[PDB]
């Protein structure tokens, strides 16, 4: 399930 916390920014 897609989620904007995970995927609306690139995290490293």
């Amino acid at each position, epitope marked *: 399930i*897609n989620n*904007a916390y995970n995927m609306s*920014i690139r995290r490293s």
Partner: antibody, heavy 114, light 111 residues
Framework: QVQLQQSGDELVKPGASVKLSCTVS????????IHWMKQRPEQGLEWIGR????????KYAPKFQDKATMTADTSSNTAYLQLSSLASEDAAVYYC???????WGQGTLVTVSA | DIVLTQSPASLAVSLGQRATISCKAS??????????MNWFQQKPGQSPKLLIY???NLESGIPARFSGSGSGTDFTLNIHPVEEEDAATYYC?????????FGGGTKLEIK
């Protein structure tokens, strides 16, 4: 569940500094960046930078490196944006955002005149 | 910086028809199989509202009339059928590399 409540509109004098706030409810700000965006009147959006409230680490867009200072208080779940040496091009609506960039504050208008 | 160029800057569409907005990036906004392109809607006096993230994912609360596609450097927002409440300015945004950048906006009007 998440709301960002920004501080009230401010008219500031050239040369002065101002500090805006962004109080977050429904979300522990230790758990994500808070981002700040600028929108000049009738213009487009610019990203100013982000702060990681857990450790205070910040990353600014280069054009705001000397203009903006971001801080955060994890106990009050509040983030602050300080703008220095105000000039007319600093007049804008400033937004905070978090949960990636999914949830935004209602904006704070800064106008600059004297 | 990654420069985002949105097309068209002004778009007039009839109710019921399909609106398409394009965002071209000067460099890739992909990393390891994910595209970091967002689309926002903004009405006057209101905060930008996230529509689509990671190029094609529909944000909670947004109807499926909105859809996103593309990868790499070329991305597209489609709205259909267009309804009165879609009149707004739309922005693309990339969040792959710093500084994050926005396109210059597309104003959607009803014809």
């Amino acid at each position: 569940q998440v709301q960002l409540q920004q501080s009230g509109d401010e008219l500031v004098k050239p040369g002065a500094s101002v500090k805006l706030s962004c109080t977050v409810s429904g979300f522990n700000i230790k758990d994500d960046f808070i981002h700040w965006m600028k929108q000049r009147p009738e213009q487009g959006l610019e990203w100013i930078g982000r702060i990681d409230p857990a450790n205070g680490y910040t990353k600014y867009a280069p054009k705001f490196q000397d203009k903006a200072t971001m801080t955060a208080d994890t106990s009050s779940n509040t983030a602050y944006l300080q703008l220095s040496s105000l000039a007319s091009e600093d007049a804008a609506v400033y937004y905070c955002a978090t949960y990636g960039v999914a949830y935004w504050g209602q904006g704070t208008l800064v106008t600059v005149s004297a | 910086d990654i420069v985002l160029t949105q097309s068209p800057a002004s778009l007039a569409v009839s109710l019921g028809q399909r609106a398409t907005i394009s965002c071209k990036a000067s460099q890739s906004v992909d990393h390891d199989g994910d595209s970091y392109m967002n689309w926002f809607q903004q009405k006057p006096g209101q905060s930008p509202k996230l529509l689509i993230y990671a190029a094609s994912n529909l944000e909670s609360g947004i109807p499926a009339r909105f859809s996103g596609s593309g990868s790499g450097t070329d991305f597209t927002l489609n709205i259909h059928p267009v309804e009165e409440e879609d009149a707004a300015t739309y922005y693309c945004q990339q969040t792959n590399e710093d500084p994050y950048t926005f396109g210059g906006g597309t104003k959607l009007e009803i014809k």
